[PDB]
Amino acid sequence: GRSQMESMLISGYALNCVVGSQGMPKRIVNAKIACLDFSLQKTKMKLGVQVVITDPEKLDQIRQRE
Amino acid sequence: NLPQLEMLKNQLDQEVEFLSTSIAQLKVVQTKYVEAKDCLNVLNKSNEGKELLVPLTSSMYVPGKLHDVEHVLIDVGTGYYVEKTAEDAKDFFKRKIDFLTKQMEKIQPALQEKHAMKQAVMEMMSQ
Amino acid sequence: VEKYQQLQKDLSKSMSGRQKLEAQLTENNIVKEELALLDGSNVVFKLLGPVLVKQELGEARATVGKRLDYITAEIKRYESQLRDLERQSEQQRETLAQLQQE
Amino acid sequence: RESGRKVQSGNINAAKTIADIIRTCLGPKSMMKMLLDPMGGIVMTNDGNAILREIQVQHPAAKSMIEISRTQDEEVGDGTTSVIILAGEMLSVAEHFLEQQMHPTVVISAYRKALDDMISTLKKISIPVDISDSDMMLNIINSSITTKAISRWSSLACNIALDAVKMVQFEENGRKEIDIKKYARVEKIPGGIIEDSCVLRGVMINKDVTHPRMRRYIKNPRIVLLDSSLEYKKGESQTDIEITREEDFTRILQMEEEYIQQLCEDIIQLKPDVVITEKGISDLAQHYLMRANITAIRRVRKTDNNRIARACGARIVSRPEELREDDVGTGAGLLEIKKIGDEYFTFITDCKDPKACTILLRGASKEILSEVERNLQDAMQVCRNVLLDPQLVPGGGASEMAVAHALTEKSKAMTGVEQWPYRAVAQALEVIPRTLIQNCGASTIRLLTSLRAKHTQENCETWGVNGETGTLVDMKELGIWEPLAVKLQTYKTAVETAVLLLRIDDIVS
Amino acid sequence: EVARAQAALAVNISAARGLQDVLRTNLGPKGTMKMLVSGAGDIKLTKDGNVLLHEMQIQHPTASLIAKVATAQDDITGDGTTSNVLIIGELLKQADLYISEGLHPRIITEGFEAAKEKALQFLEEVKVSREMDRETLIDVARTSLRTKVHAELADVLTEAVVDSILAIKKQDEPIDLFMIEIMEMKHKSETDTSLIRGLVLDHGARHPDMKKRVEDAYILTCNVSLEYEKTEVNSGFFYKSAEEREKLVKAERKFIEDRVKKIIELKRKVCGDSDKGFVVINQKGIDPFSLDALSKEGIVALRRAKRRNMERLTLACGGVALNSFDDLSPDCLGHAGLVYEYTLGEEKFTFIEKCNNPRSVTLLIKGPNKHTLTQIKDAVRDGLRAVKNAIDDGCVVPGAGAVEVAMAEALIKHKPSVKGRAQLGVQAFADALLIIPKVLAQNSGFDLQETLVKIQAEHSESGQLVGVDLNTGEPMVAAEVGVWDNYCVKKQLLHSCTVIATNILLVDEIMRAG
């Protein structure tokens, strides 16, 4: 990408990655890291918290707790 | 043609039956260990000393005054008599409950195999 | 003819109770477990033959080492009677059939 | 354990003995090889790929020869006959000399330097095309289907491919590949005429759909591609013992059915009337989509669903909770299962994916379609070669004798030892026009010299000999043309095995 | 192995030659029939171009290739196929010289093209629009018949040939699809051949005198039996278990008289009068008492009928095939204008003849039932194609290769190329034409030489199509002779001979594949 002379050693870690989005700061100076071997996704659960049925909001707010 | 089927239709019935009888008999003896666990429950529950009608001979029961509700048989070995605690019975029963459990289940596939197979022998006979 | 299944019967006969022993085999290893964990708490009788007898612990123990001799003895002997009868059964099958057909 | 000059000559003997009639096979004027069988089956074919498989291979180089022909046959499939032509030549012409003159490498090094010279010379004589003008392409595609020698049906296969290939034209690696063929998806339909065959947005799936697959006509409503993570959970969040028995049916289905509910209710939000279940498809899963009030579709190929990821143009998501139009089934979507002939055919239209139309092919029979079908498969290879390389280069001797003088002058300007490889390579070119003159029925060394005079002055710009008419010709005027790419590629491939077989001095076990 | 370049064609040229010699008379009444032992190991006689190929087990690839390609034309014509082998290798014998002189087989394959086209052009220019007169049909029929069999055998058979096609053109069918039914019949001599405008069943069932002479025939073709069985167990129901057999014993004999008296009803339903013989026709057997209960009422019931008849009978009578009997009107059971069960030898061959819209004309040949009677079973269906071709094309010319010369003349006389390159091919091309008419004469009689320089100068004199007298060996007007080349016939050999010669003329490497 760019040009060939522009090939450079970088001070840091090279990452082929998925850089985040959604209002992620695209740069954060001086940051501790969470390097996840994991995959967060969500833990599929219909009921973990707030079992109460009040609004149709709430029934899905039950499974919102994953 | 059908002569093969007619012999094949009649044969596959009995192995359903032979196996239908077997597993049906494998629940009862499995269930008595459940009940031998259960008979032990009311045993401890009443107390030592109660009159127990206990099987005596054909057409009789002998009443007897209970002692040591903790007394239980466990028959293992061939016929061998192992008298055990009220606790030891329940698990030894449950072993032989689980022991006949699989023994029940081994039959059903071979029970059902000779029916749908026989059922296939009914059609081409008539059809 | 008569000579066919005479042998296969006592074949099938000592076959199954032998296999009954295999259940009892586990039990005969478990009765070595059950009585050895009985210190004389519950009264140990041998059940050996129709007389049910006031027994002692070594009488309980030495018996089940001897009760395994059921699974030992009855199982083994039949593997003779299996083929002891089986071969003479197999032998007599083609002989008398070919005759009555011929 | 065989090696050395003998092999180095045997390599030629292996490689070269092939191309002999195979070069006569080149061009529409062609001399079919008769292949009798030890069985006695007789084969008249001008196509090496068939010829290659059927023949006893006398040498492992022939086994290697097959590879690069299969390579180009896999690479494009166009000019497969031509890849084994100049590979032997390089070897055939110089090899014995320059290894007697002692070197593998000086030729091996002179493979590349001759190579790019053509590529350099090509891009000059290869002149750009209008892909904006389908006919500026079509005429070559017409020149290509008359290379395939069906102008009857395949002239329509021209358009259908072309129109499709222009639509299946897209791709992005960040270097942005021009065409994408693995997007291009044809159909095979009895009934209708191939003139009525067309291309529509997205990937038409006839592949899993010859019958009902996703309802019939799902107009706006979505199809749901499932890469989840839908597997019905024996427990709630945990998997437990499988179901052998009634209790396992009761207890576990309690926990199972609510999870597919937890799943395919997240499906019902994206507005499918149909859900095609590639992953997580299981007795409960699709059973709940009819309970989710959406058609469910069972145990389907992801090849489609990836084609379908190019059809509605969506992605596919493994997200169990997040399942949407953008996640799966992008665009408004058009899911249409039409019976064309007797077979119900899902047409996924309203493509959200760049350009990207795929091919309706309906022939009155499968067979009447097939004649279109193969050349349309050929035209797409042709069209993309015009697309990958938008420089049309004149076919035959025009592109041939041109590079030779460069190479000679190159060799002469280099005036080393490698001159001889270029002198071999420049002369290695001349076979095909000679072969075309061999093929046409005229006297080549005349026409060769004549073609030299075409280069001595014109530089053989558009001037080769035209094997059909067997004359010095204006390939521009003739419209005889081809993309630089397949020209380059097939040639660039023909270089490679000559590099190989010259490198390889030891055949052992 | 490899037979390289010139060698590969040297194989091709040879394999054509010796077979062409066989067919120099396989053709014309002069044409000599050829027999086959090692083709099977059976005693086998045949005259025709392509069939003899297939009949033999032909190891040589050329012949092996040819049997397939001459088929497509032998599919159409059947004659000129016994001709076709000549021109092809002979053209090889032409061109191979030129490439032996040195030249490209390319330019000669090239060269043949424009010559083929002028021929195709000439084929138009030569083809004489002729009429559909049965006479005009006779001579086209018999010339193929004359080719394939004796002119006598051609003559005696020609009538029935040109007859059925009139009734199949009564259908306005441009070709011959039905009325193609041929019947070989037990006889001392193949001399006897009959034309049945309707059909012929071979059976009277098993019962004579059912009123088997039937003037008014309402045709029941019933693939179901009145014979299901007379015993306990049903026709398809078999039981080796005892209690299941006592079940079927009572109504098995009944379900017969079910279907029997359905007809007995159906008779009176159709007729009400024994006067009109009602024809029951069964693809399977029929019980004797079933026949008896039917025959006495005047019902003629036929059993063990043939599926093609069932097809034919359904179509020819406007008939019907039925899986039940019940009751139906006369017309619900299609009508044959005449039905007569005809005993020759033992077997009584039911003549069901002039069926209503007699869509299928059975052509019956009574003979020894040898391959001799099979030897005449071809020329007819062969000639059928020819008249069908003559039916196809109103344009038909003199035969005996009058076209060959007039082709070879004009096509060569002018240069269609005004080139060497094509004319070279053109030269070879129109030369292989004359092989047939000259060798026919040469086989008949006068040598290739005189007849040619006759017929050439004659055509040069004429422009009339003058062609060999195959019993003389010098030309006549084959329009007058009657030997007649259908443009449908004559055209396709130009296709084949060229198109086959194209790729086979171009081979160099040849090898065992696999």
UniProtKB/Swiss-Prot annotation, chain B:
One of its GO terms (cellular component) is cytoplasm. GO terms for biological process: chaperone-mediated protein folding; negative regulation of amyloid fibril formation; negative regulation of canonical Wnt signaling pathway; negative regulation of DNA-templated transcription; protein folding; regulation of DNA-templated transcription; retina development in camera-type eye; RNA polymerase I assembly. One of its GO terms (molecular function) is transcription corepressor activity. Keywords: Acetylation, Chaperone, Cytoplasm, Nucleus, Phosphoprotein. Highly expressed in pancreas and skeletal muscle and moderately in other tissues. The modification N6-acetyllysine is found at residue 32. The modification Phosphoserine is found at residue 46. It comes from the Eukaryota. Binds specifically to cytosolic chaperonin (c-CPN) and transfers target proteins to it. Binds to nascent polypeptide chain and promotes folding in an environment in which there are many competing pathways for nonnative proteins. Represses the transcriptional activity of MYC. Heterohexamer of two PFD-alpha type and four PFD-beta type subunits. Binds to MYC; interacts with its N-terminal domain. Belongs to the prefoldin subunit alpha family. This is Prefoldin subunit 5. It comes from Homo sapiens. The chain holds residues 11 to 137 of 154 of the full protein.
From Swiss-Prot, chain C:
Keywords: Acetylation, Chaperone, Isopeptide bond, Ubl conjugation. GO terms for cellular component: cytoplasm; prefoldin complex; protein folding chaperone complex; RPAP3/R2TP/prefoldin-like complex. Coiled coil: none annotated. There is a cross-link at residue 54 (Glycyl lysine isopeptide (Lys-Gly) (interchain with G-Cter in SUMO2)). GO terms for molecular function: amyloid-beta binding; protein-folding chaperone binding; unfolded protein binding. GO terms for biological process: chaperone-mediated protein complex assembly; chaperone-mediated protein folding; negative regulation of amyloid fibril formation; protein folding; protein stabilization. The keyword Ubl conjugation applies. It comes from the Eukaryota. There is a cross-link at residue 54 (Glycyl lysine isopeptide (Lys-Gly) (interchain with G-Cter in SUMO1)). The modification N6-acetyllysine is found at residues 9, 54. Belongs to the prefoldin subunit beta family. Heterohexamer of two PFD-alpha type and four PFD-beta type subunits. Component of the PAQosome complex which is responsible for the biogenesis of several protein complexes and which consists of R2TP complex members RUVBL1, RUVBL2, RPAP3 and PIH1D1, URI complex members PFDN2, PFDN6, PDRG1, UXT and URI1 as well as ASDURF, POLR2E and DNAAF10/WDR92. Binds specifically to cytosolic chaperonin (c-CPN) and transfers target proteins to it. Binds to nascent polypeptide chain and promotes folding in an environment in which there are many competing pathways for nonnative proteins. This is Prefoldin subunit 6. It comes from Homo sapiens (Human). The lineage of its organism: Eukaryota, Metazoa, Chordata, Craniata, Vertebrata. The gene is PFDN6.
From Swiss-Prot, chain D:
One of its GO terms (molecular function) is ATP-dependent protein folding chaperone. Gene3D superfamilies: GroEL, GroEL-like equatorial domain, TCP-1-like chaperonin intermediate domain. Its EC number is 3.6.1.-. There is a cross-link at residues 233-234, 366 (Glycyl lysine isopeptide (Lys-Gly) (interchain with G-Cter in SUMO2)). One of its GO terms (cellular component) is extracellular exosome. CDD domains: TCP1_gamma. It catalyses: ATP + H2O = ADP + phosphate + H(+). It is found in: Cytoplasm. ADP binds at residues 27, 79-82, 147-148, 396, 467-468, 482, 487. The modification Phosphotyrosine is found at residue 232. The modification N6-acetyllysine is found at residue 207. Mg(2+) binds at residue 78. ATP binds at residues 27, 79-81, 396, 467, 482. The keyword Manganese does not apply. Component of the chaperonin-containing T-complex (TRiC), a hexadecamer composed of two identical back-to-back stacked rings enclosing a protein folding chamber. Each ring is made up of eight different subunits: TCP1/CCT1, CCT2, CCT3, CCT4, CCT5, CCT6A/CCT6, CCT7, CCT8. Interacts with PACRG. Interacts with DNAAF4. Interacts with DLEC1. It is linked to Neurodevelopmental disorder with speech or visual impairment and brain hypomyelination: An autosomal dominant disorder characterized by global developmental delay, impaired intellectual development, poor or absent speech, and brain abnormalities including hypomyelination, cerebellar atrophy, and optic nerve atrophy. Some patients have severe visual impairment, dystonic movements, and seizures. This is T-complex protein 1 subunit gamma. It comes from Homo sapiens. The gene is CCT3.
From Swiss-Prot, chain E:
PROSITE patterns: TCP1_1, TCP1_2, TCP1_3. It catalyses: ATP + H2O = ADP + phosphate + H(+). One of its GO terms (cellular component) is extracellular exosome. InterPro entries: Chap_CCT_zeta (IPR012722), Chaperone_TCP-1 (IPR017998), Chaperonin_TCP-1_CS (IPR002194), Cpn60/GroEL/TCP-1 (IPR002423), GroEL-like_apical_dom_sf (IPR027409), GROEL-like_equatorial_sf (IPR027413), TCP-1-like_intermed_sf (IPR027410), TCP-1_chaperonin (IPR053374). ATP binds at residues 28, 80-82, 400-401, 485, 490. One of its GO terms (biological process) is positive regulation of telomerase RNA localization to Cajal body. Belongs to the TCP-1 chaperonin family. Component of the chaperonin-containing T-complex (TRiC), a molecular chaperone complex that assists the folding of actin, tubulin and other proteins upon ATP hydrolysis. The TRiC complex mediates the folding of WRAP53/TCAB1, thereby regulating telomere maintenance. It is linked to De novo genetic variants in nearly every subunit of the TRiC complex, including CCT6A, have been found in individuals with a broad spectrum of brain malformations, and clinical phenotypes ranging from mild to severe epilepsy, developmental delay, intellectual disability, ataxia, and other features of cerebral malfunction. This is T-complex protein 1 subunit zeta. It comes from Homo sapiens. The lineage of its organism: Eukaryota, Metazoa, Chordata, Craniata, Vertebrata.
